[PDB]
Design a protein around this motif. Sequence first.
Motif, PDB file in Angstrom:
ATOM      1  N   UNK A 136    -106.681  66.888 -20.284  1.00  0.00           N
ATOM      2  CA  UNK A 136    -106.232  67.327 -18.973  1.00  0.00           C
ATOM      3  C   UNK A 136    -107.392  68.107 -18.375  1.00  0.00           C
ATOM      4  N   UNK A 137    -108.031  67.538 -17.359  1.00  0.00           N
ATOM      5  CA  UNK A 137    -109.198  68.157 -16.737  1.00  0.00           C
ATOM      6  C   UNK A 137    -110.302  68.384 -17.764  1.00  0.00           C
ATOM      7  N   UNK A 139    -109.968  69.144 -20.731  1.00  0.00           N
ATOM      8  CA  UNK A 139    -109.520  70.051 -21.782  1.00  0.00           C
ATOM      9  C   UNK A 139    -108.685  69.237 -22.764  1.00  0.00           C
ATOM     10  N   UNK A 141    -105.792  68.338 -25.069  1.00  0.00           N
ATOM     11  CA  UNK A 141    -104.431  68.855 -25.137  1.00  0.00           C
ATOM     12  C   UNK A 141    -103.567  68.002 -26.054  1.00  0.00           C
ATOM     13  N   UNK A 166     -98.614  72.664 -24.255  1.00  0.00           N
ATOM     14  CA  UNK A 166     -98.848  71.862 -23.065  1.00  0.00           C
ATOM     15  C   UNK A 166     -97.716  70.887 -22.779  1.00  0.00           C
ATOM     16  N   UNK A 168     -95.236  71.180 -21.052  1.00  0.00           N
ATOM     17  CA  UNK A 168     -94.829  71.257 -19.658  1.00  0.00           C
ATOM     18  C   UNK A 168     -95.714  70.431 -18.739  1.00  0.00           C
ATOM     19  N   UNK A 169     -96.915  70.069 -19.176  1.00  0.00           N
ATOM     20  CA  UNK A 169     -97.844  69.372 -18.302  1.00  0.00           C
ATOM     21  C   UNK A 169     -97.474  67.920 -18.067  1.00  0.00           C
ATOM     22  N   UNK A 212     -97.387  67.878  -9.114  1.00  0.00           N
ATOM     23  CA  UNK A 212     -96.840  69.228  -9.118  1.00  0.00           C
ATOM     24  C   UNK A 212     -95.317  69.216  -9.132  1.00  0.00           C
TER      25      UNK A 212
END
Lengths: 376, 179
Positions: A136-137, A139, A141, A166, A168-169, A212
């Motif tokens: 994620x970006x 990063x 995870x 993570x 929740x992502x 989002x």
Amino acid sequence: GNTVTIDFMSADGIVPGRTPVRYQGVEVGTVQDISLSDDLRKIEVKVSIKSDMKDALREETQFWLVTPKASLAGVSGLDALVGGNYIGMMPGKGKEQDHFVALDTQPKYRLDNGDLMIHLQAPDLGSLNSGSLVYFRKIPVGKVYDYAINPNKQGVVIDVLIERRFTDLVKKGSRFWNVSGVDANVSISGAKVKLESLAALVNGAIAFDSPEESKPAEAEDTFGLYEDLAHSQRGVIIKLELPSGAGLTADSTPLMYQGLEVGQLTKLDLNPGGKVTGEMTVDPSVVTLLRENTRIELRNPKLSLSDANLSALLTGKTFELVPGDGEPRKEFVVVPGEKALLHEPDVLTLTAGQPLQVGQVIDRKTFTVAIEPQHR
Amino acid sequence: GNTVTIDFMSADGIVPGRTPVRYQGVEVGTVQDISLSDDLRKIEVKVSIKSDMKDALREETQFWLVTPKASLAGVSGLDALVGGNYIGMMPGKGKEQDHFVALDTQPKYRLDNGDLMIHLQAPDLGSLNSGSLVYFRKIPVGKVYDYAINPNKQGVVIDVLIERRFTDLVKKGSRFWNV
């Protein structure tokens, strides 16, 4: 002490004395003996077990031989080089068994903790070896857990792991795309070549984005993998009936508006009967302009006498957007650039591209011509 | 001698005899025993501790297993190859605890000395792995400490370290760029 007979196809670096049986490294016991029966590779290994683990010893209890692996694809000799060739086991909730068959390799195990497991559908694996990393970006995870083939032979199902912190992502609308392998990015009048990170190339990788507003996904929810970040772009789809895709390319032909790229042709196919149809992606920012009496025309790179534009010539054919007004629509018929004046809301049609400038000739045979609405 | 029960998901190259517990390398004690409970990967490790460290042993005391790492991204087997698989700990200022869970890996620790810590906002990480290096005129003057994700999913927050002797070089108007 107990006794368990395990069948091995091969038993390479094993000695009866010290071959301590480990379950995540805790010694469950030691091999009692290694032998064979009727010279048929049924290597029977008698093993002693601590009685504490004896209860869980059941039918589904799996066993395997760990080994140092200095091969092209393997580094899993971290402990076997130091502690020697041990064997690994996994308890099972079977009924009971004493005679067993060792699994060829170490099987994949699931941590009991609270993580997330999800499924990706992909027509092909790509360069995603087990252990390839999820970003994620950029990063990390989570990682790839396993891959397999769906019962139909027309796809691949990967199942992947995401850490607790993570969970929740991952949303329902979240999009996954492959990031792996390295290419060249040659552009006109200069070029630069930056695609991915070293690990992303050695191992392959995935990246994902999360909208989002969507809700969090859960419980082995399936997802679709996109071969590239570009194919993962969130844009609206438009169906196009074309005259002929002479210069058109399925993922290089752009859509112009006010001099800027807004859309990109995605699919280009031949239908039966000689008809050609394609489909295009558009940025949402312009979708409101897509309405009735909105025409789309294929432009051509013109040989300008004044501004000799090399990039236009190199690019070849290009579409064009010219907004209209009316109800939203998603199916369009592309018009040739010559006949753009013809397919207009207001145009004075009379009964080959010659001018009149206050108008242009449409066709010959009889002459058909057109005049602009403002000069009408 | 003391007793501490630590929960391990896995305990790979550990022997009860010689698994000396280290705190920046100073031996705090040795493992007393390794066992498991109800076959559910709750690998309970009983550990002896020198009473000097017993006082600081509290709830927030973290533990982890160090291991040689000859993988694609890892060279942290400098000591484990020679001294064997030991375990690392960090004291905490909790209240007290005796039953613990080992952290999966070695966590990032902050030196108490006078250095500088600062935050960089970036929409993406780039190819900046932990340990990537910070330059002033190509002179290294600090390194990357850690990276994380801001609560919003629209960015990344890196936190980085700068040595004492260069703390004057960082100004409000100073600009950072990726290389």
